[PDB]
């Protein structure tokens, strides 16, 4: 566990820009952008932050950072348009260059495979609720790991499992939009197939390190049985199955629409080199209704622009209780705060809230590590101001704000902050 792994991560989709550049085909984000009601302020991820010409000015703000990892994910429409069949050498170029400056600059590669931008092609043949979407993730996963594991010595297959299938599948807050349970289930699982087949395929190319990338939250609430539903949702409804013991009693009173094979279990739960851990914040709940017998209680302490409870006791229990149910080093792979960032042209963002909120988690993050949890990194979500999602651009994670219009990006208190930490921490 030599030397502890600081550093910043992005995600394709959220930062690249080109949306239609060099042959990249259209993702279900792309699409889902598209109608009225999807994203906050009615924008897209075009152009972003135009990373994917302003790279090399990018990899320069993580070198004057002192960072030594940078967290990042490829956009699969980019390596496969059609998600299937053919593939377009312009998206391996451009992550094969990537990998070479990133190197040039003293910086390893974190490379996540699936960061939610399925291949529109592949959605329309159903997406996540065919497993042949699964077969063409491992295909996918093979022809990136053939070109960069040479370099690129950390792979994650999936990122946030949870997300894609129920926050797009059932709540259909997110791509492709579905709110259908069933079609949820079927895409949790069918996700879970397409980590273990991935794995395989890595592993068969080379990928020196490989893992997953799950987000927790701790659930609290006065009803431990309404908790315990929470709980067995938020964290082991995909940690279980990848560790090889199943799935745990499912949070839903409702059942799967077919059988799960005993064969699928063993190929899901294949040995990892590390679990992704991301952490943001807590959740509280009460008993209720529908599907899932529980009903979300706002926050009751203070909180960030997303009106998510900030608890760094949390991350705390939450590294210390993954270090004995996890057999493999743990790494944090997000943890940031979104807060009302303003730039009127000074030189430096003041960034007070969000320099307390990264403080007081790293501060939790050591205590737990000093305690015995094989924690061996910690990487502060986004690097710049970026597409959040849902919430388009009305939302920055960012340590340099970026103003958008122009592109330039502003370094936040937080940016300044982050380069002592590391730097002492040394």
């Given at each position: 566990a030599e030397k502890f792994l600081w550093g910043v991560a992005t995600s394709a989709y959220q930062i690249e820009g080109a949306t239609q550049e060099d042959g990249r085909g259209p993702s279900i984000w792309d699409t889902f952008a598209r109608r009225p009601g999807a994203?906050?302020?009615?924008?897209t991820g075009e152009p972003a932050c135009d990373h994917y010409h302003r790279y090399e000015e990018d990899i320069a703000l993580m070198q004057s950072l002192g960072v030594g990892v940078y967290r990042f994910s490829?956009?699969?429409?980019?390596?496969?348009?059609?998600?299937?069949?053919?593939?377009?050498?312009?998206?391996?170029?451009?992550?094969?260059?990537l990998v070479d400056r990133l190197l040039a600059a003293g910086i390893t590669p974190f490379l996540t495979l699936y960061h939610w931008d399925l291949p529109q092609a592949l959605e329309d043949r159903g997406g996540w609720r065919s497993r042949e979407t699964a077969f063409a993730f491992?295909?996918?996963?093979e022809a990136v790991a053939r070109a960069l594991a040479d370099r690129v010595p950390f792979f994650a297959t999936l990122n946030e499992p949870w997300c894609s299938a129920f926050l797009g599948h059932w709540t259909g807050e997110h791509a492709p939009g579905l709110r259908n349970l069933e079609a949820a289930l079927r895409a949790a699982h069918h996700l879970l197939l397409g980590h273990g087949l991935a794995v395989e395929a890595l592993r068969?190319?080379?990928?020196?390190?490989?893992?997953?990338v799950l987000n927790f939250a701790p659930?609290?609430?006065?009803?431990?049985?309404?908790?315990?539903?929470?709980?067995?949702y938020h964290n082991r409804y995909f940690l279980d199955p990848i560790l090889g013991r199943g799935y745990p009693e499912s949070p839903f009173q409702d059942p799967?629409?077919?059988?799960?094979?005993?064969?699928?279990?063993?190929?899901?739960?294949?040995?990892?080199?590390?679990?992704?851990?991301?952490?943001?914040a807590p959740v509280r709940v009460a008993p209720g209704t529908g599907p899932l017998p529980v009903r979300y209680l706002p926050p009751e302490?203070?909180?960030?622009?997303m009106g998510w409870e900030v608890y760094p006791e949390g991350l705390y229990h939450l590294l210390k209780r993954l270090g004995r149910e996890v057999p493999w080093p743990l790494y944090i792979t997000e943890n940031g705060a979104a807060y009302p960032d303003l730039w009127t042209g000074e030189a430096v963002v003041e960034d007070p809230e969000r320099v307390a909120y990264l403080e007081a988690h790293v501060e939790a993050a050591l205590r737990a590590r000093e305690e015995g949890v094989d924690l061996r990194g910690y990487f502060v979500w986004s690097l710049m101001d970026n597409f959040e999602?849902?919430?388009?651009?009305?939302?920055?994670?960012?340590?340099?704000y970026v103003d958008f219009p122009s592109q330039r990006r502003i370094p936040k208190r937080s940016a300044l902050w982050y380069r002592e930490r590391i730097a002492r921490a040394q």
């Open positions: 994203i906050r302020d009615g924008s490829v956009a699969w429409p980019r390596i496969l348009p059609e998600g299937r069949g053919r593939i377009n050498p312009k998206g391996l170029a451009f992550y094969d260059r491992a295909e996918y996963a068969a190319a080379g990928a020196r390190r490989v893992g997953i659930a609290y609430g006065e009803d431990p049985e309404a908790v315990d539903v929470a709980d067995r799967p629409p077919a059988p799960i094979l005993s064969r699928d279990l063993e190929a899901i739960a294949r040995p990892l080199d590390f679990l992704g851990v991301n952490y943001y302490g203070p909180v960030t622009a999602w849902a919430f388009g651009y009305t939302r920055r994670f960012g340590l340099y």
